[PDB]
Coordinates of C-alpha atoms in Angstrom, one line a residue:
Chain A
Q272 CA 101.9 74.3 175.1
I273 CA 99.7 71.3 175.0
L274 CA 96.1 71.1 176.4
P275 CA 93.9 68.0 177.0
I276 CA 91.0 69.6 175.0
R277 CA 90.3 70.3 171.4
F278 CA 88.4 73.6 171.2
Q279 CA 86.8 74.5 167.9
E280 CA 84.5 77.0 166.2
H281 CA 82.3 75.2 163.7
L282 CA 80.4 78.3 162.4
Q283 CA 79.0 81.8 163.0
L284 CA 75.2 81.9 162.7
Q285 CA 75.4 85.6 161.9
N286 CA 77.1 84.5 158.7
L287 CA 74.0 82.7 157.7
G288 CA 71.5 85.6 157.8
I289 CA 70.3 84.6 161.3
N290 CA 69.0 87.6 163.2
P291 CA 71.1 88.2 166.4
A292 CA 67.8 88.8 168.3
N293 CA 66.7 85.2 167.6
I294 CA 69.9 83.7 169.0
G295 CA 68.6 82.7 172.4
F296 CA 67.1 79.9 174.6
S297 CA 63.5 80.8 173.6
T298 CA 64.0 81.0 169.8
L299 CA 67.0 78.7 169.1
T300 CA 67.0 75.0 169.8
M301 CA 69.7 72.3 169.5
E302 CA 68.7 68.7 170.4
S303 CA 71.8 67.0 168.9
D304 CA 75.0 67.9 167.0
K305 CA 73.1 67.3 163.7
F306 CA 70.6 70.3 163.6
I307 CA 70.1 73.8 164.8
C308 CA 66.5 75.1 164.7
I309 CA 65.7 78.8 164.9
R310 CA 62.4 80.6 165.0
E311 CA 62.4 83.9 163.3
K312 CA 59.7 86.4 162.0
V313 CA 60.3 87.9 158.6
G314 CA 58.1 90.9 157.8
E315 CA 54.9 90.0 159.8
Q316 CA 55.5 86.4 158.6
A317 CA 56.7 83.7 161.0
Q318 CA 59.1 81.0 159.8
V319 CA 61.4 78.2 161.0
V320 CA 65.0 77.8 159.9
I321 CA 66.7 74.3 160.2
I322 CA 70.4 74.2 159.7
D323 CA 71.8 70.8 158.8
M324 CA 75.2 70.5 160.3
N325 CA 76.4 68.2 157.6
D326 CA 75.6 71.0 155.1
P327 CA 75.6 74.2 157.1
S328 CA 76.3 76.5 154.2
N329 CA 72.7 76.2 152.8
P330 CA 69.9 76.6 155.4
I331 CA 66.2 75.9 154.6
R332 CA 63.6 78.6 155.5
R333 CA 60.2 77.0 155.8
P334 CA 57.1 79.1 156.7
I335 CA 55.9 77.6 160.0
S336 CA 53.9 79.2 162.8
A337 CA 54.8 77.6 166.1
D338 CA 55.7 78.8 169.6
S339 CA 58.3 76.1 169.8
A340 CA 60.1 73.8 167.4
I341 CA 62.5 70.9 168.3
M342 CA 64.2 68.6 165.8
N343 CA 64.7 64.9 166.2
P344 CA 68.2 64.0 167.4
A345 CA 68.8 62.2 164.1
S346 CA 65.8 61.9 161.8
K347 CA 64.5 64.7 159.6
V348 CA 61.5 64.8 161.9
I349 CA 60.4 67.9 163.7
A350 CA 58.1 68.5 166.7
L351 CA 56.2 71.8 166.9
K352 CA 54.0 73.4 169.5
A353 CA 51.1 75.8 168.8
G354 CA 49.3 76.9 171.9
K355 CA 48.2 73.7 173.7
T356 CA 48.4 71.8 170.4
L357 CA 51.4 69.5 169.8
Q358 CA 52.4 68.0 166.4
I359 CA 55.2 65.6 165.3
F360 CA 55.8 66.5 161.6
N361 CA 57.8 64.7 158.9
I362 CA 60.0 67.3 157.2
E363 CA 61.1 65.3 154.2
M364 CA 57.6 63.9 153.5
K365 CA 55.8 67.2 154.3
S366 CA 53.3 65.1 156.2
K367 CA 52.0 65.0 159.8
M368 CA 53.0 62.0 161.8
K369 CA 51.3 62.5 165.2
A370 CA 49.3 65.1 167.0
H371 CA 48.1 65.9 170.6
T372 CA 46.2 68.7 172.3
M373 CA 47.1 69.1 176.0
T374 CA 44.8 70.1 178.9
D375 CA 47.4 72.2 180.8
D376 CA 50.1 74.0 178.8
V377 CA 53.5 72.4 178.0
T378 CA 56.1 74.7 179.7
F379 CA 59.2 72.7 178.5
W380 CA 59.9 69.9 176.0
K381 CA 62.9 67.9 174.8
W382 CA 63.8 64.8 172.8
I383 CA 64.7 62.1 175.3
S384 CA 65.9 59.9 172.5
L385 CA 65.3 59.3 168.8
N386 CA 61.5 58.6 168.8
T387 CA 60.7 60.0 172.3
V388 CA 59.8 63.5 173.2
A389 CA 59.4 64.5 176.9
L390 CA 56.7 67.0 177.9
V391 CA 56.7 69.2 181.0
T392 CA 53.6 70.9 182.3
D393 CA 53.4 72.8 185.5
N394 CA 52.1 69.7 187.3
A395 CA 53.7 66.6 185.7
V396 CA 56.2 65.1 183.2
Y397 CA 55.1 63.1 180.1
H398 CA 56.7 60.8 177.6
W399 CA 55.3 60.9 174.1
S400 CA 56.4 58.3 171.5
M401 CA 57.0 59.3 167.9
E402 CA 56.0 55.8 166.9
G403 CA 52.5 54.4 166.6
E404 CA 49.3 56.0 167.9
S405 CA 50.3 56.2 171.5
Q406 CA 49.2 59.3 173.5
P407 CA 51.6 61.1 175.9
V408 CA 52.2 58.9 178.9
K409 CA 52.5 60.5 182.4
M410 CA 55.8 59.6 184.1
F411 CA 55.7 61.4 187.4
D412 CA 54.1 64.4 189.2
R413 CA 56.2 67.6 189.6
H414 CA 57.6 68.1 193.1
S415 CA 56.6 71.2 195.1
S416 CA 60.2 72.2 195.3
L417 CA 60.2 72.9 191.6
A418 CA 57.1 75.1 191.8
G419 CA 57.6 78.5 190.2
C420 CA 60.9 77.4 188.7
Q421 CA 62.0 78.0 185.1
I422 CA 62.6 74.5 183.7
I423 CA 65.9 74.4 182.1
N424 CA 66.4 70.7 181.4
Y425 CA 65.1 67.1 181.6
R426 CA 67.4 64.0 181.5
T427 CA 67.1 60.2 181.9
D428 CA 69.7 57.3 182.3
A429 CA 70.3 54.8 179.5
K430 CA 67.8 52.2 180.7
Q431 CA 65.3 55.1 181.4
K432 CA 64.7 53.9 185.0
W433 CA 65.9 57.2 186.4
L434 CA 64.3 60.5 185.4
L435 CA 65.6 64.0 186.2
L436 CA 63.9 67.4 186.0
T437 CA 65.9 70.6 186.5
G438 CA 64.6 74.0 187.3
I439 CA 66.1 77.3 188.4
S440 CA 64.8 80.4 190.2
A441 CA 66.0 83.7 191.5
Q442 CA 66.3 83.7 195.2
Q443 CA 68.1 86.7 197.0
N444 CA 70.4 87.6 194.1
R445 CA 71.4 84.0 193.5
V446 CA 70.2 81.6 190.8
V447 CA 69.0 78.6 192.8
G448 CA 68.9 75.2 191.2
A449 CA 66.0 72.7 192.0
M450 CA 66.1 69.1 190.8
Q451 CA 63.7 66.2 191.1
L452 CA 65.2 62.7 190.8
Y453 CA 62.5 60.2 190.1
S454 CA 63.0 56.4 190.1
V455 CA 60.7 54.4 187.9
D456 CA 61.1 51.2 189.8
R457 CA 60.8 52.6 193.3
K458 CA 58.1 55.1 192.1
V459 CA 59.5 57.9 194.4
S460 CA 61.1 61.3 194.0
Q461 CA 64.0 63.0 195.7
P462 CA 64.4 66.8 195.6
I463 CA 68.0 67.9 195.1
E464 CA 69.7 71.3 194.9
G465 CA 71.6 71.1 191.6
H466 CA 72.4 73.4 188.7
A467 CA 73.5 70.9 186.0
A468 CA 73.4 67.1 185.9
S469 CA 74.0 64.0 183.8
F470 CA 73.8 60.2 184.0
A471 CA 76.6 57.8 183.1
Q472 CA 77.3 54.1 182.7
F473 CA 80.7 53.2 184.3
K474 CA 82.2 49.8 185.0
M475 CA 84.5 49.9 188.1
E476 CA 87.8 48.2 188.6
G477 CA 87.1 44.5 189.3
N478 CA 83.3 44.8 188.7
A479 CA 81.2 42.4 186.7
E480 CA 78.5 44.9 185.4
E481 CA 78.3 48.6 184.5
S482 CA 77.2 50.9 187.4
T483 CA 74.7 53.7 186.7
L484 CA 76.1 56.9 188.0
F485 CA 74.2 60.2 188.7
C486 CA 76.5 63.2 188.4
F487 CA 75.4 66.8 189.3
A488 CA 77.1 70.1 189.8
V489 CA 75.8 73.0 191.8
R490 CA 76.9 76.4 193.3
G491 CA 74.7 76.1 196.4
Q492 CA 74.7 76.1 200.2
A493 CA 78.2 74.6 200.4
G494 CA 79.5 76.6 197.4
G495 CA 80.5 75.0 194.2
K496 CA 80.3 71.2 194.5
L497 CA 80.4 68.2 192.1
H498 CA 78.7 65.0 193.1
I499 CA 79.2 61.6 191.6
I500 CA 76.9 59.0 193.1
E501 CA 75.5 55.5 192.1
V502 CA 71.8 55.3 191.7
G503 CA 70.0 52.3 193.0
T504 CA 70.9 48.7 194.0
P505 CA 74.2 47.5 192.5
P506 CA 74.0 44.5 190.2
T507 CA 74.7 41.0 191.7
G508 CA 78.4 40.7 192.3
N509 CA 79.4 44.3 192.2
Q510 CA 81.2 46.6 194.7
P511 CA 79.4 49.4 194.8
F512 CA 80.7 52.9 193.7
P513 CA 81.9 55.1 196.6
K514 CA 80.0 58.4 196.6
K515 CA 82.1 61.4 195.5
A516 CA 81.9 65.1 196.4
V517 CA 84.4 67.5 195.0
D518 CA 84.8 71.3 194.8
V519 CA 83.9 73.3 191.7
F520 CA 86.2 76.3 191.3
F521 CA 84.8 79.8 190.6
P522 CA 87.3 82.7 190.5
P523 CA 86.7 85.7 192.7
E524 CA 85.7 87.9 189.7
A525 CA 83.0 85.4 188.7
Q526 CA 80.7 86.0 191.8
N527 CA 77.5 85.4 189.8
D528 CA 78.6 82.3 187.8
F529 CA 77.0 78.8 188.2
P530 CA 76.9 75.5 186.4
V531 CA 74.8 75.7 183.2
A532 CA 75.4 72.5 181.3
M533 CA 77.0 69.1 181.8
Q534 CA 77.9 66.3 179.3
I535 CA 79.7 63.1 180.3
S536 CA 81.9 61.3 177.8
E537 CA 81.6 57.5 178.3
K538 CA 84.5 57.0 175.9
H539 CA 87.2 58.7 178.1
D540 CA 85.1 58.7 181.3
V541 CA 85.3 62.4 181.9
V542 CA 82.7 65.1 182.8
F543 CA 82.3 68.3 180.8
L544 CA 81.0 71.3 182.8
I545 CA 80.0 74.6 181.3
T546 CA 79.2 77.6 183.5
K547 CA 77.1 80.7 182.8
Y548 CA 80.1 82.9 182.2
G549 CA 81.4 80.6 179.5
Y550 CA 84.0 78.7 181.5
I551 CA 84.6 75.0 180.7
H552 CA 85.5 72.4 183.3
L553 CA 86.9 68.9 182.9
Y554 CA 86.6 66.2 185.6
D555 CA 87.5 62.5 186.0
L556 CA 84.2 60.6 186.2
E557 CA 85.8 58.1 188.6
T558 CA 87.3 60.4 191.2
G559 CA 86.0 63.8 190.4
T560 CA 89.6 65.1 190.0
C561 CA 89.7 68.3 188.1
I562 CA 91.7 68.2 184.9
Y563 CA 91.2 71.4 182.9
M564 CA 89.5 74.7 183.5
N565 CA 89.2 77.5 181.0
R566 CA 87.0 80.3 179.7
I567 CA 86.1 79.3 176.1
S568 CA 83.4 81.9 175.6
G569 CA 82.7 85.5 176.5
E570 CA 79.0 85.0 176.1
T571 CA 76.7 82.5 177.7
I572 CA 76.4 79.1 175.9
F573 CA 72.6 78.7 176.3
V574 CA 72.2 75.4 174.3
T575 CA 74.4 72.3 174.5
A576 CA 74.4 68.8 173.0
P577 CA 76.7 65.8 172.9
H578 CA 79.2 65.9 170.1
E579 CA 78.7 62.3 169.2
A580 CA 81.5 61.8 166.7
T581 CA 84.4 63.1 168.9
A582 CA 82.6 62.1 172.2
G583 CA 82.6 65.7 173.5
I584 CA 80.2 68.7 173.9
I585 CA 78.9 71.1 171.3
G586 CA 77.1 74.3 172.1
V587 CA 75.9 77.7 170.8
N588 CA 76.5 81.0 172.5
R589 CA 74.6 84.3 172.4
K590 CA 77.2 85.7 170.0
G591 CA 76.1 83.1 167.4
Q592 CA 79.3 81.0 167.7
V593 CA 78.8 77.3 167.4
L594 CA 81.6 76.1 169.7
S595 CA 82.9 72.5 170.2
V596 CA 85.1 71.1 173.0
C597 CA 86.3 67.5 173.2
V598 CA 89.1 65.3 174.6
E599 CA 92.3 65.5 172.7
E600 CA 93.2 61.8 172.8
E601 CA 96.8 62.4 171.8
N602 CA 97.5 65.0 174.6
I603 CA 95.3 64.1 177.6
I604 CA 97.7 61.6 179.2
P605 CA 100.8 63.8 178.7
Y606 CA 99.0 66.8 180.1
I607 CA 97.7 65.0 183.2
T608 CA 101.2 63.7 183.7
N609 CA 103.4 66.8 183.1
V610 CA 101.2 69.9 183.2
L611 CA 98.7 68.8 185.9
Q612 CA 101.5 66.6 187.4
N613 CA 99.0 63.9 188.6
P614 CA 100.8 60.7 187.6
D615 CA 98.3 58.5 189.6
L616 CA 95.4 59.7 187.5
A617 CA 97.5 59.5 184.2
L618 CA 98.3 55.8 185.0
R619 CA 94.6 55.0 185.9
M620 CA 93.4 56.8 182.7
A621 CA 95.8 55.1 180.3
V622 CA 94.9 51.6 181.6
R623 CA 91.2 52.3 181.9
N624 CA 90.7 53.7 178.5
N625 CA 93.2 52.4 176.0
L626 CA 95.1 55.7 175.7
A627 CA 98.8 56.1 174.9
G628 CA 101.6 58.3 176.3
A629 CA 101.9 56.7 179.8
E630 CA 105.0 54.5 179.0
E631 CA 107.5 56.3 181.1
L632 CA 105.2 56.0 184.2
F633 CA 104.8 52.3 183.8
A634 CA 108.5 51.8 183.7
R635 CA 109.0 54.0 186.7
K636 CA 106.3 52.2 188.7
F637 CA 108.0 48.9 187.7
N638 CA 111.6 49.8 188.6
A639 CA 110.3 51.2 191.9
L640 CA 108.5 48.1 192.9
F641 CA 111.4 46.0 191.7
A642 CA 113.8 47.9 193.9
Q643 CA 111.1 47.7 196.7
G644 CA 111.4 43.9 196.9
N645 CA 107.7 43.7 196.1
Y646 CA 108.0 41.5 193.0
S647 CA 104.4 40.3 193.2
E648 CA 103.0 43.7 192.6
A649 CA 105.7 44.6 190.1
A650 CA 104.5 41.7 188.0
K651 CA 101.0 43.0 188.0
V652 CA 102.2 46.4 186.6
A653 CA 103.9 44.6 183.7
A654 CA 100.8 42.5 183.2
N655 CA 98.4 45.5 183.0
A656 CA 100.4 47.5 180.5
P657 CA 98.1 49.3 178.1
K658 CA 99.5 47.8 174.8
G659 CA 101.9 45.1 176.2
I660 CA 104.5 47.8 176.9
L661 CA 106.2 45.8 179.7
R662 CA 105.4 42.4 178.2
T663 CA 108.9 42.0 176.6
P664 CA 111.9 39.8 177.0
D665 CA 113.9 42.5 178.8
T666 CA 111.3 42.2 181.6
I667 CA 111.8 38.4 181.9
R668 CA 115.6 39.0 181.8
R669 CA 115.1 41.3 184.8
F670 CA 113.1 38.7 186.7
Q671 CA 115.6 36.0 185.7
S672 CA 118.3 38.1 187.4
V673 CA 116.8 37.5 190.8
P674 CA 117.5 34.2 192.6
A675 CA 115.7 31.5 194.4
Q676 CA 115.4 32.5 198.0
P677 CA 114.8 30.2 201.0
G678 CA 111.4 28.9 199.8
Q679 CA 110.1 32.4 198.9
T680 CA 111.0 31.6 195.2
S681 CA 110.8 32.9 192.6
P682 CA 110.0 36.4 191.2
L683 CA 110.1 35.1 187.6
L684 CA 107.8 32.2 188.8
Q685 CA 105.5 34.9 190.3
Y686 CA 105.5 36.9 187.1
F687 CA 104.3 34.0 184.9
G688 CA 101.8 32.9 187.5
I689 CA 99.7 36.1 187.2
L690 CA 100.5 36.6 183.5
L691 CA 98.6 33.5 182.2
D692 CA 95.6 34.7 184.3
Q693 CA 95.2 37.7 182.0
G694 CA 95.4 36.0 178.6
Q695 CA 97.5 33.8 176.4
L696 CA 101.3 33.7 176.9
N697 CA 103.4 34.6 173.9
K698 CA 105.8 32.2 172.2
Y699 CA 108.9 33.5 174.1
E700 CA 107.1 33.5 177.5
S701 CA 106.0 29.9 177.0
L702 CA 109.6 28.8 176.2
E703 CA 111.2 30.4 179.2
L704 CA 108.3 29.1 181.4
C705 CA 108.8 25.4 180.6
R706 CA 112.6 25.3 180.7
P707 CA 112.9 25.2 184.5
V708 CA 109.8 23.0 184.7
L709 CA 111.1 20.3 182.3
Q710 CA 114.5 20.6 184.0
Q711 CA 113.8 18.5 187.1
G712 CA 111.5 15.7 186.2
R713 CA 108.3 17.7 186.0
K714 CA 106.1 17.4 182.9
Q715 CA 102.5 17.0 184.2
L716 CA 102.0 20.7 184.6
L717 CA 102.2 21.1 180.8
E718 CA 99.2 18.8 180.4
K719 CA 96.9 21.3 182.3
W720 CA 98.5 24.3 180.5
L721 CA 98.1 22.8 177.0
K722 CA 94.6 21.4 177.6
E723 CA 93.5 24.8 178.9
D724 CA 95.2 26.3 175.8
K725 CA 96.7 29.2 177.8
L726 CA 100.1 29.4 176.0
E727 CA 101.1 30.0 172.4
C728 CA 103.2 27.3 170.7
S729 CA 105.8 27.6 168.0
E730 CA 108.3 24.9 166.9
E731 CA 111.1 25.7 169.3
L732 CA 109.0 24.5 172.3
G733 CA 108.2 21.2 170.6
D734 CA 111.8 20.0 170.1
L735 CA 112.4 21.3 173.7
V736 CA 109.7 19.1 175.2
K737 CA 110.5 16.4 172.8
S738 CA 113.8 16.2 174.6
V739 CA 112.2 14.3 177.6
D740 CA 108.7 13.1 176.4
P741 CA 108.1 13.0 172.7
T742 CA 104.5 11.9 173.1
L743 CA 103.7 15.3 174.7
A744 CA 105.8 17.1 172.1
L745 CA 103.2 15.9 169.5
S746 CA 100.5 17.9 171.3
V747 CA 102.8 21.0 171.2
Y748 CA 103.6 20.4 167.5
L749 CA 99.9 20.0 166.7
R750 CA 98.9 23.4 168.0
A751 CA 102.1 25.0 166.5
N752 CA 100.8 24.2 163.0
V753 CA 104.1 22.6 161.9
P754 CA 103.0 19.6 159.9
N755 CA 106.6 18.4 159.1
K756 CA 107.2 17.8 162.8
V757 CA 103.8 16.2 163.5
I758 CA 104.1 13.6 160.8
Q759 CA 107.6 13.0 162.0
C760 CA 106.1 12.0 165.4
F761 CA 103.6 9.6 163.9
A762 CA 106.4 8.1 161.9
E763 CA 108.7 7.5 164.8
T764 CA 105.9 5.8 166.7
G765 CA 104.7 3.8 163.6
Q766 CA 101.2 5.3 163.5
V767 CA 100.8 5.3 159.8
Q768 CA 97.1 5.7 159.5
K769 CA 97.3 9.0 161.4
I770 CA 100.0 10.2 159.0
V771 CA 97.7 9.9 156.1
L772 CA 94.6 11.3 157.9
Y773 CA 96.6 14.4 159.1
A774 CA 98.3 15.2 155.8
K775 CA 94.9 15.0 154.0
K776 CA 93.3 17.3 156.5
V777 CA 95.9 20.1 156.7
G778 CA 96.8 19.7 153.0
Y779 CA 100.5 19.2 153.7
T780 CA 102.3 16.9 151.2
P781 CA 105.3 15.0 152.5
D782 CA 107.8 12.8 150.7
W783 CA 105.5 9.7 150.6
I784 CA 108.0 7.3 149.1
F785 CA 110.7 8.2 151.6
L786 CA 108.2 7.5 154.4
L787 CA 107.3 4.2 152.7
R788 CA 111.0 3.1 152.7
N789 CA 111.3 4.0 156.3
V790 CA 108.2 2.0 157.1
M791 CA 109.4 -0.9 155.0
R792 CA 112.8 -0.8 156.7
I793 CA 111.5 -1.1 160.3
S794 CA 108.5 -3.4 159.5
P795 CA 107.2 -4.4 156.0
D796 CA 103.9 -5.7 157.2
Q797 CA 103.0 -2.1 158.1
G798 CA 104.6 -1.2 154.8
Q799 CA 102.1 -3.0 152.7
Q800 CA 99.2 -1.4 154.6
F801 CA 100.7 2.0 154.1
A802 CA 101.1 1.3 150.4
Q803 CA 97.4 0.6 150.3
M804 CA 96.5 4.1 151.7
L805 CA 98.8 5.9 149.3
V806 CA 96.7 4.7 146.3
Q807 CA 93.0 5.6 146.5
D808 CA 90.6 7.2 144.0
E809 CA 90.7 10.6 142.3
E810 CA 93.6 11.8 144.2
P811 CA 96.5 9.3 144.8
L812 CA 99.0 10.5 147.3
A813 CA 101.8 8.6 145.6
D814 CA 102.9 7.1 142.3
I815 CA 101.9 3.4 141.9
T816 CA 105.0 2.5 139.8
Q817 CA 107.2 4.2 142.4
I818 CA 105.8 2.2 145.3
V819 CA 106.1 -1.2 143.6
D820 CA 109.8 -0.8 142.8
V821 CA 110.2 0.1 146.5
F822 CA 108.6 -3.3 147.2
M823 CA 111.1 -4.9 144.7
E824 CA 114.1 -3.3 146.5
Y825 CA 113.2 -5.4 149.6
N826 CA 112.2 -8.3 147.3
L827 CA 108.7 -8.4 148.8
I828 CA 107.3 -10.1 145.7
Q829 CA 104.5 -12.0 147.4
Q830 CA 103.3 -9.0 149.4
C831 CA 103.8 -6.7 146.4
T832 CA 101.6 -9.1 144.5
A833 CA 99.0 -9.1 147.4
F834 CA 99.2 -5.3 147.5
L835 CA 98.2 -5.0 143.8
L836 CA 95.5 -7.6 144.0
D837 CA 94.1 -5.8 147.0
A838 CA 94.2 -2.5 145.0
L839 CA 92.1 -4.1 142.3
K840 CA 89.4 -5.3 144.7
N841 CA 89.2 -1.9 146.3
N842 CA 88.7 -0.4 142.9
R843 CA 85.8 -2.8 142.3
Chain B
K35 CA 85.9 33.4 163.8
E36 CA 85.5 30.2 161.8
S37 CA 89.1 29.0 162.0
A38 CA 89.1 28.1 165.7
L39 CA 86.0 25.9 165.3
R40 CA 87.7 23.6 162.7
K41 CA 90.8 23.7 164.8
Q42 CA 89.1 22.2 167.9
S43 CA 87.8 19.3 165.8
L44 CA 91.4 18.6 164.6
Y45 CA 93.0 18.4 168.1
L46 CA 90.3 16.0 169.1
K47 CA 91.3 13.5 166.4
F48 CA 95.1 13.5 166.6
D49 CA 96.5 15.0 169.8
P50 CA 96.8 12.5 172.7
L51 CA 94.6 14.6 175.1
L52 CA 93.8 12.3 178.1

């Protein structure tokens, strides 16, 4: 049966000559889905193996002596530790970029981003830039709550205004998580009991700006819990985000399991959670609703990283398996709908992220609200269909089937009213909208609609409005791109100059002579002026011989004469 | 991208507007 995830084994490190003993937190590092760096010791000689994930078949064994080696999340740049001596080294250029010797030993280090490596000593946290000649900069002092802890991770939000250090320690046959949440702006720290955490940018329903969320999981004093909270003051004109606290499930057999890693997918707005035993967890970032749970590994997955391409999580376990889990975009909505049986979440998910497979639900929600008498909300459902699913003529036909009530009218009127607020109305919607408006002496509303440019025009609307006010029809015809019907309007109303200017701009060529004859018929004086415009240099709109015999037909000999003499003076 | 810009100039010259 279907599952909302896509689990994959990318490679087995044992198949690349990697020693099983070196497959561990202390000797193996993964800072991104791009490289895996292992520290091994061959025959009394210490070396560093870097595995390019684009070309994993052929690993490079370079002879490097370091107590720690971490690659750049993208660049072929490595950072190596030797005692208290740090060094950012260019792999491709075999040249040293930067260097620093620390007073107190660096107990943990990670790449915060491309060009930034964070350093953790027993007393403080530093940020060391790969660029320039800048020394490591102190960010904050380590909290007493984290004293004696084994530092397992360090994270920051996008804007890097919030920093987070995580450490764990063994207290009474339980691994206890200690975190320090430091705010750069407020310059203060908050100690938090948490095992795994992550930051996320999330824009709420009806919110102007993106909210910065802090999400952490723990198996602590109140058992397994997942918290989703907004950090700091919300931007001007925002809601804020209501704090979430949900349970994290640990089966009875897994009594010494706890959260080990967490990655949040901004794309689908879901939280990935990996526990010590190898269980994966899937949560909705918005509500903290659990979606999928499963054991994917028999061995602990000690290192994790975001799987950038698929917007998922990629880790490595003690067995040497390089595992990858991500959202299966084709199956997530059906699964939430039918296997999880959580329609409300499926609906929210399909509209939030533009995912597909929700159609039956939108129809159900519509038919239910239609039967409910609530036509106002029923319209909103049709309006916020993921890919214009309920924005069809059948919908309008349904709304047309309901009457005008005593003054509460009309559900079709209501449907259109909210619809234009979302975007531009389609050709058919515009047609059905104006029909009852034009029907009883009301045309001014069109002026606002057309000036605001909220509806899409084709020809069928123009001849419909032309039926009462042909001057307004010209505006419709103009936007509809139909030149034939635009020139026709200028011709009925005698505006000859605009006929020529328009046809020259849009490149449309009409039957100039036939237009001349029409002009000549109604009023010859205008005829002669029009004849003048038809012949001007390089590109003449009409044949000169053809226009003069038109003059002759009406026996306009004197004006024909005048026309030609004028034509000579304009050529001079 | 560039089409809408030349379009607005056109409506200004011929369509009745006001």
